C-alpha cells in the first residue's frame, strides 16, 4: 500500500513489539533491512546481516542491506538454516516479520543445495539425491540440448549424467529459470585426481581479521566454494589470493588485466607463497614459459580470449590447459567478465573452484545478475569506513572543486551539441589555473600528485604547459617504468599525469594527492576503482582523520556536473562525503597561467583547432 506522500504504508504488516532499544533491526517487507550502528548490538547484527543480506548503503549511522535469493543461497552455503536465521531476525526485528518475507525465505531455502555439479575426468556431472527433480529437468528442451548425448544423437543415462562443456553457461541461466541453482562444492581435502603442490605460507604473511573472516566464509565446512569477494584496493587483495591458493594447494590459475598485474601477482607469490619459482609460469605474449611443470599459472584474458590465430606455442599451452584439470582458478576485476570474449574464457577453461576478487561491482551495463551464475554469489564485502577507523586504509579527504566556465568558452559550450563539447569543458582555463594553484600548494606541502585525465589531448596539453611527465595511449613500457621509478624515489618528480591507462593496466605507486580533471562520462565504478587504487594507507598521518587527499575539478553549469553526481553515487553509498568548494584562497596572491584574457583566448583557439575529428 502506498501513502499519498510516496511512502509505502507498512504499519499494517509490521506489528511492533515493545523491545525497541534491545532490537536494532527494521525489516521492511520490500526486502530492505535497516540497522542502527549506535546500537550496543551493532557488531552481532552486522555479522549476521553480512552473511544473509547484501549491503546497499553503509553511512555513519543507519545502514541499509538488501535480501536476495543469491544472498540466501550464499548464507546456506555458509551453513545457516532457515529456523536459526528467522529466530535471530525476530530477536532483532523491531516489528513483526512479514509473512511474505518469511514465505520468500521458505521458498528459496528449500530449493537450495539440491542440484550439484561435479567435474571429474574432464566431464561435468549433474547429480541430486532426488531423481524426481532430475527427471523433471530432463523435460526442458534447452536442458535436452545442453545435456551430453552420444555421437549417435542419443542422450546418455544417486544418478547423474555428463554435460556438454560448451553448453554450461546457457544451462546456468536455465537453472535460475528452473529455480534450482547449481551447488559449487569442491572436495578441498577429498581430491585425489589432482596432486598437491609444495606451496605454503611464509611466516611474513599476516591475515587481518576481516581477511581471515572472508576466507572462512569462503571455505564453508572446510571445503572451497566458488564465489565473489569484494576487497578495497590496497587491502592486500593479492595477499588474500595467494593465501587462498596456498590453502587449496591444488592447480592454481590466475587471470589479470595486463602483464603488469601478472608481474605483481608473481612477486606476491614470491613474497608470501613457498612454491618453487620453477613451478611458476606466466602465459604472456612477451615473457613465455613452458606450461609443463607450471604448478601455478598467471595469464591474461586477452591471451586466453585471443579468438584470432595465435602462436604455435600458444596452441600447445591452450591444449595443455584444456588437458589440465584446474581445482582452483582466480579471476581479478570481475566487473570486466560480463564481456562476451572474457565470458567465453570461462567455457574454455575447465576449472573446479573459481574465485573472483575485485574492488567494485557496479557495472553500468547492469550485467551482474547473470554474473551471479558465471561465478557465484558475492561472498564478502568489507566496510570501508570500518577499515578507515581500524587504520588499515588511509582516510580519504574528498573534495569537489567547482571551476566556473569562461563565458567565451561557455558560449561555445552552448554552441556545440555534439561529442566535441567534451573538449570545451575539459579545457577550462579557470580549471587550469585552479589545478596549477593546487599543484603548487601540494608541492610546497611535499605530496605526491597524480593527475587523472581521460582525454589524451587534454592530458598532454596540461602536462606540457606545466612541464610534467605525461602518460597516454602507447606509453612505451620502458619509459613508463622509468617515469614511475623516478616518481617513487626522485624528489624532483612528484607530479605525474596519467591517462585512462592508470586504472588497471599497471600498478599505481602510492600517492596522497589525486586530482581528477577528465571523466569517462559517468563511470561510477571505473573512477572509484582508480581512486581507491591510487590512495593507500600512509604512515605518519595515521592519527589524523585526513591522511589522503582527493580533489575533483568540475566545470560549473556543464554536463560535467551531472556526470560527477552520478559518479559519486557509489562513493556516497560507501559513506564517503564530498565537500563542494568554489573559492580557492591564495590563488589571487599567486601568479598562474592564463592570467591575461588573450592567453585564455589563445587556448580557446588551440582547442577549437582540435575539431570533432580529434
Amino acid at each position: 500500500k502506498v501513502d499519498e506522500y510516496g511512502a509505502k504504508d507498512y504499519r499494517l504488516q509490521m506489528p511492533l513489539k515493545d523491545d525497541h532499544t534491545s532490537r536494532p533491526l527494521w525489516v521492511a517487507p520490500d526486502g530492505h533491512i535497516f540497522l542502527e550502528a549506535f546500537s550496543p548490538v551493532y557488531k552481532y547484527a552486522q555479522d549476521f546481516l553480512v552473511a544473509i543480506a547484501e549491503p546497499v548503503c553503509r553511512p555513519t549511522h543507519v545502514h541499509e542491506y538488501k535480501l536476495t535469493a543469491y544472498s540466501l543461497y550464499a548464507a546456506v552455503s555458509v551453513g545457516l538454516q532457515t529456523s536459526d536465521i528467522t529466530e535471530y531476525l525476530r530477536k532483532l526485528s523491531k516489528t513483526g516479520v512479514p509473512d511474505g518475507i518469511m514465505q520468500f525465505i521458505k521458498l528459496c531455502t528449500v530449493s537450495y543445495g539440491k542440484v550439484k555439479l561435479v567435474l571429474k575426468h574432464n566431464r561435468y556431472f549433474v547429480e541430486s539425491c532426488h531423481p524426481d527433480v532430475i527427471q523433471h529437468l530432463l523435460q526442458d528442451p534447452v536442458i535436452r540440448e545442453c545435456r551430453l548425448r552420444n555421437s549417435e544423437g542419443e542422450a546418455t543415462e544417486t544418478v547423474s549424467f555428463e554435460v556438454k562443456q560448451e553448453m554450461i553457461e546457457e544451462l546456468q541461466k536455465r537453472c535460475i529459470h528452473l529455480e534450482y541453482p547449481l551447488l559449487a562444492e569442491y572436495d578441498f581435502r577429498n581430491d585425489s585426481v589432482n596432486p598437491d603442490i609444495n606451496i605454503d605460507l611464509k611466516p611474513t604473511a599476516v591475515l587481518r581479521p576481516y581477511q581471515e573472516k572472508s576466507l572462512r566464509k569462503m571455505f564453508g565446512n572446510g571445503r572451497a566454494r566458488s564465489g565473489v569477494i569484494v576487497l578495497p584496493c590496497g587491502a592486500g587483495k593479492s595477499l588474500v589470493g595467494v593465501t587462498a591458493a596456498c590453502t587449496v594447494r591444488k592447480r592454481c590459475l590466475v587471470l589479470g588485466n595486463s602483464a603488469v598485474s601478472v608481474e605483481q601477482w608473481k612477486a606476491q607469490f614470491k613474497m608470501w607463497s613457498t612454491i618453487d619459482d620453477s613451478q611458476i609460469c606466466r602465459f604472456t605474449s612477451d615473457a613465455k614459459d613452458k606450461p609443463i611443470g607450471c604448478s601455478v599459472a598467471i595469464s591474461t584474458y586477452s591471451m586466453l580470449g585471443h579468438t584470432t590465430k595465435r602462436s604455435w606455442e600458444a596452441e600447445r599451452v591452450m591444449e595443455w590447459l584444456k588437458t589440465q584439470e584446474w581445482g582452483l582458478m582466480i579471476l581479478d576485476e570481475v566487473h570486466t567478465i560480463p564481456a562476451k570474449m572474457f565470458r567465453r574464457v570461462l567455457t574454455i577453461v575447465q576449472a573446479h573452484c573459481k574465485l573472483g576478487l575485485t574492488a567494485t561491482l557496479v557495472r553500468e551495463d547492469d550485467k551482474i545478475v547473470d554474473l551471479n551464475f558465471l561465478i557465484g554469489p558475492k561472498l564478502y564485502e568489507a566496510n570501508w569506513m570500518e577499515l578507515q577507523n581500524n587504520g588499515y586504509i588511509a582516510k580519504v579527504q574528498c573534495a569537489e572543486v567547482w571551476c566556473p566556465m569562461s563565458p567565451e568558452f561557455y558560449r561555445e559550450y552552448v554552441a556545440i551539441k555534439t561529442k566535441k563539447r567534451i573538449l570545451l569543458y575539459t579545457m577550462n582555463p579557470n580549471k587550469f589555473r585552479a589545478c596549477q594553484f593546487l599543484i603548487k600548494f601540494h608541492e610546497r606541502r611535499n605530496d605526491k600528485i597524480i593527475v587523472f585525465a581521460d582525454n589524451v589531448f587534454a592530458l598532454k596539453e596540461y602536462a606540457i604547459r606545466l612541464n610534467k611527465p605525461y602518460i597516454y595511449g602507447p606509453t612505451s613500457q620502458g619509459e613508463r617504468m622509468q617515469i614511475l621509478q623516478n616518481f617513487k624515489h626522485n624528489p624532483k618528480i612528484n607530479t605525474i599525469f596519467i591517462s585512462k591507462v592508470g586504472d588497471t593496466s599497471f600498478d599505481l605507486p602510492e600517492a596522497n594527492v589525486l586530482i581528477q580533471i577528465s571523466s569517462h562520462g559517468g563511470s561510477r565504478r571505473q573512477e572509484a576503482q582508480r581512486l581507491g587504487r591510487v590512495l593507500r594507507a600512509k604512515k605518519g598521518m595515521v592519527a589524523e582523520e585526513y591522511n589522503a587527499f582527493f580533489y575533483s575539478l568540475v566545470s560549473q553549469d556543464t554536463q560535467e556536473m551531472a556526470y560527477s553526481t552520478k559518479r559519486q553515487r557509489f562513493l556516497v553509498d560507501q559513506g564517503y562525503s564530498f565537500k563542494v568548494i568554489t573559492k580557492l584562497a591564495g590563488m589571487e596572491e599567486e601568479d598562474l597561467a592564463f592570467s591575461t584574457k588573450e592567453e585564455q583566448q589563445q587556448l580557446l583557439q588551440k582547442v577549437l583547432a582540435a575539431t570533432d575529428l580529434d
Binding site: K43, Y44, A45, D47, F48, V78, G79, L80, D84, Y88, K91, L92, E212, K213, L215, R216, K217, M218, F219, G220, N221, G222, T247
Partner: peptide, 15 residues
Amino acid sequence: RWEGGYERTWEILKE
C-alpha cells in the same frame, strides 16, 4: 587452518 569453519550465531543471543 582456521578456515575449516567459523560461525558467530551464538554471539547473536538474547541478553
